[PDB]
Amino acid sequence: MTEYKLVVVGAGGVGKSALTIQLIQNHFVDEYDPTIEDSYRKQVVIDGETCLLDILDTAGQEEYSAMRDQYMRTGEGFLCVFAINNTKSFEDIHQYCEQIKRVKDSDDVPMVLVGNKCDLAARTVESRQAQDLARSYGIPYIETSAKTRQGVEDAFYTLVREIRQH
């Protein structure tokens, strides 16, 4: 099988852990316990091939920001997550991606922009604004909701497809 070193980044509280745990265990985490570093290995079948996803759940707190430079050179693909009900998280993910391309020293890094918490009706970030940012980086954009599991597999599978070619 093929291994993929996925990394889930984003500001605090956007739903990174809830998205990852939903993918591997189909539970929905409604508690918010902050993450410092969480490693998950789950075997997956994407497009007929057996994939072992080594997903790295990172810390969104600004205290562990020095770890960004570390895992943004190890990971092969990055799931850059924000909360559609949080405009501050949408511009926070703007510099997450810019930081990725700089420490990867590349203009072609596998990334997937992900707007989370789409089950909520109090949206403040339009998809037009998100696809604007995604098209400017040449990366896909996928709206997800860790609660209803909408588009959860789509977002993780799309990043694997981006790494598979590259």
């Binding site: 591997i24 969480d38 007929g48």
Partner: protein
């Protein structure tokens, strides 16, 4: 900080938060459960070259330490293979008709391709 670095099986790791009075067996339950693991199938060390600890150990007794959780002696990891079931079979997740899907020869788990993420993480019988 009240944090403990813990290295989990199948080459995984986490960093748990510690509350005074809370146990070690309870502090690592969530991390072990979301990875398809059970603590009473595992033995927790504390790295020194490792010292075995009892699961009832106070989680405050090892703050700032680095632990590791390993399996007892006498399985893990699936071996998925494309199989097209001629014998009348159904999926093991949605229980609906399964003719063209995947199965792990080691576990015997059979499922559709879109029914892949709901397969248990750990695999038995090696």
């Amino acid at each position: 900080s009240n944090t403990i670095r813990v290295f989990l099986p199948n080459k995984q790791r986490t960093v748990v938060n510690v509350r005074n009075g809370m146990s070690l067996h309870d502090c690592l339950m969530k991390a072990l459960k979301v990875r398809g693991l059970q603590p009473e199938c595992c033995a927790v060390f504390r790295l020194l070259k490792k010292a075995r600890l009892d699961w009832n150990t106070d989680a405050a007794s090892l703050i700032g330490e680095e632990l590791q959780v390993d399996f007892l002696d006498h399985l893990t990891t699936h071996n998925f293979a494309r199989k097209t079931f001629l014998k009348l079979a159904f999926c093991d997740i949605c229980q609906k008709f399964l003719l063209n899907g995947f199965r792990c020869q080691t576990c015997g788990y059979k499922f559709h391709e879109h029914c892949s993420t709901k397969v248990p993480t750990m695999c038995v019988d090696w």
